[PDB]
Amino acid sequence: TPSYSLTPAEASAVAELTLELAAAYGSFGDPVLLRDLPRLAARLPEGVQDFLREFKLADRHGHTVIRGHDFDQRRIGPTPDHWRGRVRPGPEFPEELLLMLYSALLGEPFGWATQQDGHLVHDIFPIRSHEKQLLTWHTEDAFHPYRSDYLILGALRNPDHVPTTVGELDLSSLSAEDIDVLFEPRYHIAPDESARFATIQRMIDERPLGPLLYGSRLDPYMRLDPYFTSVPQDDTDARRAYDALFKVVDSGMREVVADQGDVLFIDNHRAVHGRLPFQARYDGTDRWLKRVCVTSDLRRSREMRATSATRLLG
């Protein structure tokens, strides 16, 4: 897995640009910032832009990391208790901007109106409120036709080096028989728990059966969320193939640590991901990540978006 290590000079330039932009724009509520994003991302160090572009175009690896950012711990301040009621943007606005810049290099930032107040940057920190742990991995929103194409995870702080899990598809293990079955529309994937108007909420609803593999039959994409995946009982070939696919992916899972100053890029088409359970202090010094969802085609999701301009689904 290729990764990019920032020099002190690259890290200083990135930090400086990130502070200049934060002072220049109000928030992500500023429509002109969302407009300028791709042009702004061109002001990043050229090696960083080149690296990400190669990741995007290569379409080979499930994940990549840019390491060595300068995330000023004094400015960022203590890891908050919760996300709701918290004034946005915070002092960590610079870092959120960075992820939005990276997102603009891979596509467009988008989010869910019903998730975290519909903020384009998600918070990932221990919560005393929302508190034997099963170890799960999934494709992000595997059921959804307009699911993320990429995820960007920025490690603001990670004092105990708690890894993320990411897994890819090894084809050598699977037979051609099983692959062909998985490519066919024979599987149900269920949604999740996720204003009055216009045509209320649940719009373009639940419909057909779909495949688990797609794209190239020699190097396929996947959407795999094992907990919410069911196969019709009469379909024994599909059940045999789903079993074999699960074994390959489950047994291939890797631990990847996003330490402080790391940005992890996950390809939602080539890789599954999962959180790892960890003992939290709850004292403002806890592990803290930011997450941005990236779509390659914003217009493809128009029917589930309130307006043309909005990047929030639902």
Next chain:
Amino acid sequence: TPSYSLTPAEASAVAELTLELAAAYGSFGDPVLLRDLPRLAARLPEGVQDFLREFKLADRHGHTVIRGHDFDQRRIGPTPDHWRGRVRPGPEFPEELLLMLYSALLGEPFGWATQQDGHLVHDIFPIRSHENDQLGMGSKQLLTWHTEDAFHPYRSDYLILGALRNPDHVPTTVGELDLSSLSAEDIDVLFEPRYHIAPDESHLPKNNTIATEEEAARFATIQRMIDERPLGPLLYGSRLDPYMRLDPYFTSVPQDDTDARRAYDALFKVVDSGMREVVADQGDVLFIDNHRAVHGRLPFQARYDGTDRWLKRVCVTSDLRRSREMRATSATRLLG
């Protein structure tokens, strides 16, 4: 319809950048150029960048034009007799890069493997042997309007046409949907899966080789569409400001569906009467939203003497990986 007119200064800066890039890069066969495209496009005049970005994000107008480019006629040379057997790249390489920079501001340039040797930037000029019938390389005969490859799930999201020369000012026809000209009842019908759109003969899997699994799977979805003949909508997106796919020559309204026939005829009249002539004169670059506009060309008399109309054409996709199944490798931008 909003447009952008380059000041002579912007025109000068664009040409300079374009010449520099032409010298620094060998051809489009260079993967690094494809890699560098959007970082390179960030070197264009800032007004231009902001203009296209606003066009892309507004998702309202179906076409726009950037006018006032300096396309140097001495450097570009005579309009060629044919696209086959030309030295790649030609003396007009700088103009090709410009269109590739523009495409990179809207998405990713892509092509069709069997079209003009698989070049990302297409030539549009009269070819004598091609002068009998309707196409983009003839001249004498009418090109009735349409959505590009309306049937195809991975059709272009945008088209970019650059006018290297147009001495007789032969316009391009483009038409949009005036939604207020249709009844609410007819709109509901058009959003429903009640219509058959047939592929152009060029996309038929039986055209290419029957050999191997790799090639069979690469056409398997298109072949399924031909065998099952699924019915589809002609309007989609949001019911308030909808996308359209309308290729009248390849659209079948099933005989017994009377509601569909009424709605279609209605949609046809609106789009036919809204057809506008947009002249892509020398130095003009036309952007077409393939989800919000239809396009065609007018018939014109060609001279075949190296002075004829010459356009360059690039196809843009907003999501390159969506079409992976129909591409030989991950690297290739060519479907088929």
